[PDB]
Amino acid sequence: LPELLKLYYRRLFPYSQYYRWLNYGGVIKNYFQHREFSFTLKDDIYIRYQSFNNQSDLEKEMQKMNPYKIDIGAVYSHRPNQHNTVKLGAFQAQEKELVFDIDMTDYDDVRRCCSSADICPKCWTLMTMAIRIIDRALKEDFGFKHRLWVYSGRRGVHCWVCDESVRKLSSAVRSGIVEYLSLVKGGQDVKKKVHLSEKIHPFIRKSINIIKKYFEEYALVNQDILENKESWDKILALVPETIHDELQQSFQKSHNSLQRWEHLKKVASRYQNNIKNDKYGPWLEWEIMLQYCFPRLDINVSKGINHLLKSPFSVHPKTGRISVPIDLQKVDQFDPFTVPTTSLAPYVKVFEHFLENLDKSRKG
Amino acid sequence: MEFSGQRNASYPHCLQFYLQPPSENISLIEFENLAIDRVKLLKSVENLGVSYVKGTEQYQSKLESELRKLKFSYRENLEDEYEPRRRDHISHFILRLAYCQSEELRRWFIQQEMDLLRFRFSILPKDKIQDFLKDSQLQFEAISDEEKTLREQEIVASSPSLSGLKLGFESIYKIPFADALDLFRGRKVYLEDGFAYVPLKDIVAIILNEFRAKLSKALALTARSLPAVQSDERLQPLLNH
Numbered sequence: 001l002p003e004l005l006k007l008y009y010r011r012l013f014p015y016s017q018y019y020r021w022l023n024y025g026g027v028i029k030n031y032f033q034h035r036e037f038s039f040t041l042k043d044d045i046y047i048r049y050q051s052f053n054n055q056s057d058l059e060k061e062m063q064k065m066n067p068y069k070i071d072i073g074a075v076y077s078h079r080p081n082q083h084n085t086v087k088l089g090a091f092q093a094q095e096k097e098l099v100f101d102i103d104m105t106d107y108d109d110v111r112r113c114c115s116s117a118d119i120c121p122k123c124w125t126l127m128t129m130a131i132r133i134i135d136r137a138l139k140e141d142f143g144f145k146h147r148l149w150v151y152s153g154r155r156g157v158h159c160w161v162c163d164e165s166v167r168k169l170s171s172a173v174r175s176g177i178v179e180y181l182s183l184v185k186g187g188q189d190v191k192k193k194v195h196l197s198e199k200i201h202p203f204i205r206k207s208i209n210i211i212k213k214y215f216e217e218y219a220l221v222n223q224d225i226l227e228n229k230e231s232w233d234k235i236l237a238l239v240p241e242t243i244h245d246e247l248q249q250s251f252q253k254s255h256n257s258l259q260r261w262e263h264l265k266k267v268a269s270r271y272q273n274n275i276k277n278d279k280y281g282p283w284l285e286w287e288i289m290l291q292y293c294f295p296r297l298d299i300n301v302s303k304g305i306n307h308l309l310k311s312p313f314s315v316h317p318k319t320g321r322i323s324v325p326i327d328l329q330k331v332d333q334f335d336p337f338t339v340p341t342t343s344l345a346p347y348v349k350v351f352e353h354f355l356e357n358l359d360k361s362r363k364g
Numbered sequence: 365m366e367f368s369g370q371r372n373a374s375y376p377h378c379l380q381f382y383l384q385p386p387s388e389n390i391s392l393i394e395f396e397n398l399a400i401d402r403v404k405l406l407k408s409v410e411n412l413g414v415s416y417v418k419g420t421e422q423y424q425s426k427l428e429s430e431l432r433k434l435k436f437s438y439r440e441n442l443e444d445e446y447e448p449r450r451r452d453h454i455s456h457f458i459l460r461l462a463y464c465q466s467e468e469l470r471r472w473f474i475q476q477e478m479d480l481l482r483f484r485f486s487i488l489p490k491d492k493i494q495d496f497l498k499d500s501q502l503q504f505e506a507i508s509d510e511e512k513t514l515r516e517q518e519i520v521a522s523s524p525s526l527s528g529l530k531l532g533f534e535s536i537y538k539i540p541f542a543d544a545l546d547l548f549r550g551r552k553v554y555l556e557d558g559f560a561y562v563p564l565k566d567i568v569a570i571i572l573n574e575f576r577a578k579l580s581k582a583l584a585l586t587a588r589s590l591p592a593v594q595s596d597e598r599l600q601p602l603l604n605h
Binding site: 141179 | 545
């Protein structure tokens with residue numbers, strides 16, 4: 001791995017674009033010098049609180065250490081590489097991009113073709129829906145303009161939202177943003193994770209609209225979510241016990257997940273129309289669809305201003321893949337198995353398009 | 365035919381936000397009793413709370429009797445209520461220093477102030493809302509009100525709490541989802557493309573929040589800057605007991 005990283009950090013890493021990104025035109029005094037970075041090296045040796053006076057310092061350090069993994073931190077009250085010179089308690093984080101972290105391993109209770117840190121073309125449709133739902137929310141509902149989506153290198157993607165107002169958000173509002181973006185509740189042992197009110201806020205409506213474009217191909221065809229009793233038991237844990245007998249009988253009489261899901265919707269519709277006073281909510285179909293397709297997140301990644309998350313155009317040590325950006329005009333056409341390990345130019349072009357929008361917004 | 369022929373400016377409304385220092389004089393017994401009667405009021409708000417549920421008509425009916433008995437500002441009167449308003453203003457400035465002696469005491473009196481403010485905002489007639497929102501910095505401009513009936517259909521279909529009548533009598537105007545923060549993060553009500561179809565009470569919550577922020581900054585200033593004024597402090601023990 002180190003020789004490939006030496007060549008990569010010499011010839012292929014986009015330093016000018018990276019410095020242009022995190023310096024934000026130099027409008028704010030010593031902003032890039034106050035930016036934190038963190039390096040992970042051979043045998044997982046570790047160096048936190050890196051920071052660089054200019055693009056040359058960044059280039060020199062990344063070529064010197066040749067890190068396996070790089071993480072980006074906050075803008076601090078002082079230069080992080082000089083934090084040993086600062087008074088007690090005076091070294092503090094001040095600003096940070098609103099960062100989201102989405103991994104395929106988080107879906108192991110609903111995906112069936114793969115598990116753990118491995119992925120395949122069947123389950124990566126979840127990441128297409130996840131990117132689209134989160135990005136659409138950030139675009140339309142939150143109104144944030146500059147949103148950089150990046151593949152982690154193996155098992156997921158990261159979103160870096162880079163507006164100035166976004167960079168100045170507080171921990172409480174960051175947590176509120178995640179909570180609003182988190183219909184899927186609870187830990188690994190919680191059986192039912194999505195619950196909906198009798199009448200629904202328009203934010204949720206759009207998620208079902210996106211999911212419908214992929215739910216057949218993903219859930220009913222590739223995952224086959226109602227293939228057998230073991231698979232449909234997990235869905236029956238989401239529904240009233242009064243209709244478990246009827247649903248089991250209908251599933252047994254039905255040949256495949258397509259017919260079984262149609263029967264589930266029919267039974268759910270009849271139960272919804274028949275009984276008002278039950279503890280289960282009426283939008284049962286939407287709850288099942290959302291639990292099997294909606295985005296999933298770690299609130300600790302986003303809430304902490306001083307948190308460290310993986311750098312764009314860093315590398316993965318076992319796959320060898322570069323942490324490339326994802327084109328929002330062509331999300332469905334991205335493929336993690338085609339990622340480079342020159343052919344890197346389209347991803348740098350996505351980064352440069354994002355930065356041209358950023359610069360034009362700053363100037364206009 | 366056309367014919368030919370001062371304290372109004374101080375408080376055009378009973379509502380006040382303590383921006384201007386009253387640059388005048390006071391008596392010893394005057395500032396003493398102006399503050400002490402309000403200490404009794406602070407306790408009385410929570411005594412009424414332990415009596416029965418917050419903000420009901422029983423609360424409302426008893427509370428105004430407290431104000432008439434205690435001679436401080438009211439639901440806004442057209443005669444010389446400016447004297448109660450300046451008494452309220454002056455005595456508010458005097459009250460900053462007593463229960464700054466502990467953060468728990470600060471929070472205690474802040475909480476009864478929020479309850480009192482919520483009551484006053486609950487009392488408001490329409491003309492008060494119309495003139496105070498324009499005369500204050502609390503502008504919060506409305507946009508494209510004719511669309512409200514499309515949201516009379518959509519909100520009603522989309523909300524458990526709201527109803528078609530609330531669209532008009534809790535008169536709806538367009539401001540962002542973030543001004544209805546608890547409503548978006550709880551996903552309680554119809555908001556769309558980041559915008560909220562908002563009645564006055566959300567702006568009341570914002571008023572209370574910025575009031576708390578400004579008052580907390582003032583309490584920090586009270587803790588720090590005050591020692592030049594502290595030539596006399598004999599009331600402070602009797603106030604904290």
